[PDB]
Amino acid sequence: QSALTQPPSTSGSPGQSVTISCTGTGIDVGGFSYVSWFQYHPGKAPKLIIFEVTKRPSGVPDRFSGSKSGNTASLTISGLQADDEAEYYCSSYAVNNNFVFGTGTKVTVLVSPRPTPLSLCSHPRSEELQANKATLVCLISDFYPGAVTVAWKADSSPVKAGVETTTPSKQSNNKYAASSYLSLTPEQWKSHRSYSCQVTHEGSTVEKTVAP
Amino acid sequence: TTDNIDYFDISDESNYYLISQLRPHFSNIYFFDEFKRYASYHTEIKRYEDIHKTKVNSLLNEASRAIGICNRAKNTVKGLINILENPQKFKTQRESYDVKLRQYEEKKEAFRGCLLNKNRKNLDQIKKINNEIRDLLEKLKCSQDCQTNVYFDMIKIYLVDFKKMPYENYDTFIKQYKNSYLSGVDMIRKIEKQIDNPVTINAIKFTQKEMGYIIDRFEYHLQKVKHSIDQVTALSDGVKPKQVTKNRLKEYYFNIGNYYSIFKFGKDSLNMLNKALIHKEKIVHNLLGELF
Amino acid sequence: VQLVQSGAEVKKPGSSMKVSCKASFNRYVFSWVRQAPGQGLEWMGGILPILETTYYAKNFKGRVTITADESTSTVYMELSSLTSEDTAVYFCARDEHDYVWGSYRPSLTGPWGQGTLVTVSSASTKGPSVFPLAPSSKSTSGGTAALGCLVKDYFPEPVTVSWNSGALTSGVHTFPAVLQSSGLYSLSSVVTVPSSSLGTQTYICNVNHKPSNTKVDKKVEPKS
């Protein structure tokens, strides 16, 4: 039937607990005792964490424990660790050989510092301006959490055309990275005094500036 | 050569209710019979003869009256199965196998839909009694401090009623069947190219096409009974609150009754799906021996 | 046991794509689950080759077809009428037990495939236009100035960027690509080198885009 319900975000401190839910109907969750859970790392294959509502597979640590009561199944991860930070899906068998998943619950670990992003802005090069194109390369790195908002100001005037910003990406040192670009024309480049790249992160905005 | 086709059930488009050829046809009627025992306790809703005599019996009679309108369709498919699953009776007439195969699918779906279309108003009455049970349960003097003693006095009874059903025997019987059924599929698929027996092999294929459908239906209630057995067992060991809200108790009564009615609904079907499975396998044991 | 799927595929919109899933006794059911970017897992359908029954989710009515070959134990999933929303990572997941896992089939508590990514895009194969981002001597950021290369307009992903033929590793930071509205990709790679070496040491970024058979080496020099 309809996709199962899961909260998009759940938090928990290391050494404590966290509880996520899985709401369904009487034809998928509330119908059968076959409700499974899955820990998902992006890029790789999921891993079965819970089978038959409460049976644990081989190798799964004993702190993972699921349950259900009527129409809402719930999984509880006790003693959180750095490896537990992933997306957690729930699933259930349905009538007529149907199988439905959940919306996924992003689990986060509160055991980490929160550095502010370090922005590096690069002005257009002489080779790019000679091809009737202009791209301002604004680069963001070393920020936790991975949630930044980029704003561009063309000579103290907010510019919205030609802006392309990537989604955050976790780095090798467990921090996140992002980048933004501003497509312009050589006339617009040689017209203003200077451009800026404002990046707001956790209420604090860091801005860089380039000029011809 | 089967003499009964009561294993055929149909589900509505909403997939909430289930209609079966065996009485009381609906899973919710068993829940209505159990709700009379719930109302037999509380005095503020002790007037239970009105629900039993008027709504429930007329619903059970209107359900039994509805299936009688599909009797011609039931007797039509019963004749087509006995002819198709027996090559000696199929070869008496000269209709081709592929034509009889297409007629079986159309004549059977018309009989299944006859059980659903002739009970659309009965399904609308099923909702009328569920809202009637909720509107009647409002008459309790309790509100936020409702006692659950009768709720847990019932669970003790439901655990005893579950012990009479042999789940382990049904679990071993179905696995015994699916192994002898799948092994027969590999045997036919290995000799169909080396054996020149079209009228018999195709009839053996027609029997296996039904057997897989019965296992799909026999396992459904088995999953639902496992739900009724596992959920109620956790209620006797989980939290035992002495006081809940009036709306939470309405969710307490409609929960165990939905589990027990489904349990008693699965116990009746599996008792029939047992003989329905064995009969189809007795034919294969004789259709295979006739093949060799 | 283990499952092995085919490599990454890049198909044009409207075309037909098939994905394989080779397995190491094929009585189990074989499902197919994807995840669109920023979306959740979605079951598509299964197939019981012993009974020759094929299941399909309601959201996929006729667009997905599942075939199975007993000779090689390979289950195939073919998706017709490909749109830009079908770009996802497609998995194949078998059941835990064979027909005897109670009655939970299609259960997906069995082994999974390694994963196959499918990129549906209308853009054509194009080589990148690399531009050298000169190190800004005005902002040395404490003596460790930064230079880099701009990989603009390339398709498809990915591109491998190296500096000094891999000899220079400290300070290198290649940022993930951006997807422009024109369907083309763009990224950058920046190194952090001391400013004293900006006037004597040569720095050459090496961008390799194998799908287009293109490789560009740009000489990043100070502004002059």
Author numbering:
A (entry chain F): 6 to 217
B (entry chain D): 171 to 462
C (entry chain E): 7 to 30, 34 to 233
Sentences from the paper on this structure:
The parasite adhesin P. vivax Reticulocyte Binding Protein 2b (PvRBP2b) binds to Transferrin Receptor 1 (TfR1) and Transferrin (Tf) on the surface of reticulocytes, which is critical for red cell invasion. PvRBP2b interacts with TfR1 through its C-terminal domain (residues 461–633) with a buried surface area of ~1271 Å2, and with Tf through its N-terminal domain (residues 168–460) with a buried surface area of ~386 Å211.
253245 binds an adjacent overlapping epitope and makes contacts with α5, α6, α7, and residues S184–Y186 of the N-terminal loop. Superimposing the crystal structures of PvRBP2b-241242, PvRBP2b-253245, PvRBP2b-258259, and PvRBP2b-273264 onto the PvRBP2b-TfR1–Tf cryo-EM ternary complex reveals that these antibodies cause steric hindrance with TfR1–Tf. The ability of these antibodies to directly interfere with TfR1–Tf binding is consistent with these antibodies showing inhibition in all interaction assays. 241242, 273264, 258259, and 253245 competed with each other and were inhibitory in the reticulocyte-binding, FRET, and IP assays. 3E9 shows steric hindrance with 241242, 253245, 258259, 273264, and 283284, while 6H1 shows steric hindrance with 251249. Out of the 23 PvRBP2b human mAbs isolated and examined in detail, eight of these including 239229, 241242, 253245, 258259, 260261, 262231, 273264, and 346343 were inhibitory across all three of our functional assays; reticulocyte-binding, FRET, and IP.
